């Protein structure tokens, strides 16, 4: 059974997401323009990422027990997870029809070529698109999606974590809420191994994140590309 606390945790995560994710994509008009030339999509996409980093921080602050962490633990959890949560939350704009992220217009519709135009290769792109397709095929409830994002953020094994025990107790409450949720609310046959599948996606994001870092370091090595990023991205991903 889903306790009152469990249901309250879920209600809070949904609202937090509803507050930090704008399915109209209206703000994208403020980004440097997309241009479709080496690295033509990088300014636009660097702005999209930096914007998304702010939304993810906003979401994280609303996670039950996250505010109980020290400032240091909050910073290290956000710094490692940011990219992963952005890949996760991006699933909402991803569409299987054209394997692309569709944000309401042709200008804000992003495909594999757009990503390559931001300085990425098939090495990262292929596993990213495969990740989006596998998540998409889970067809998660919105409740599940927002729980997965919270569980991704509050992982006790992220580098630089000091109070692993506290981070782990936070995550545990969220995992148990997810487990019970699937059991009580997710009907078969969709629920089959659903928890194990969602956890395997967290493993996939970690690999993707490891790969992303290598690419990010190669980009950080040419300061004329690094120049095109935002201050928040440099802070959060390093320089």
């Amino acid at each position: 059974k889903l306790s009152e606390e469990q249901q309250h945790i879920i209600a809070i995560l949904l609202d937090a997401h509803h507050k930090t994710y704008d399915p109209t994509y209206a703000d994208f008009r403020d980004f440097r323009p997309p241009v479709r030339s080496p690295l033509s999509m990088l300014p636009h996409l660097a702005d999209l990422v930096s914007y998304s980093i702010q939304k993810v921080i906003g979401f994280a602050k609303m996670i039950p027990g996250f505010r109980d962490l020290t400032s240091d633990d909050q910073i290290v959890l956000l710094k490692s997870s940011a990219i992963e949560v952005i890949m996760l939350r991006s699933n909402q704009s991803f569409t299987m029809d054209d394997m692309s992220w569709d944000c309401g217009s042709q200008d804000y519709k992003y495909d594999v070529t757009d990503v390559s135009k931001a300085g990425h290769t098939l090495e990262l792109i292929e596993p990213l698109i495969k990740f989006q397709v596998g998540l998409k095929k889970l067809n998660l409830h919105e409740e599940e999606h927002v729980l997965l994002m919270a569980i991704c953020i509050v992982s006790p094994d992220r580098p630089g974590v000091q109070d692993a025990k506290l981070v782990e107790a936070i995550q545990d409450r969220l995992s148990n809420t997810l487990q019970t949720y699937i059991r009580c609310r997710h009907p078969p046959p969709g629920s089959h191994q659903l928890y194990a599948k969602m956890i395997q996606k967290l493993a996939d994001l970690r690999s993707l994140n490891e790969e992303h870092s290598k690419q990010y370091r190669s980009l950080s090595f040419q300061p004329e590309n690094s120049m095109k990023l935002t201050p928040l991205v440099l802070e959060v991903f390093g320089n």
Binding site: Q54, I57, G58, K61, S71, D72, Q74, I75, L78, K79, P231, L232, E235, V236
Partner: peptide, 11 residues
């Protein structure tokens, strides 16, 4: 500690 912008968005 080395992250003023992130720290300010956190508060």
């Amino acid at each position: 500690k080395n992250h003023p912008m992130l720290m300010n968005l956190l508060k």
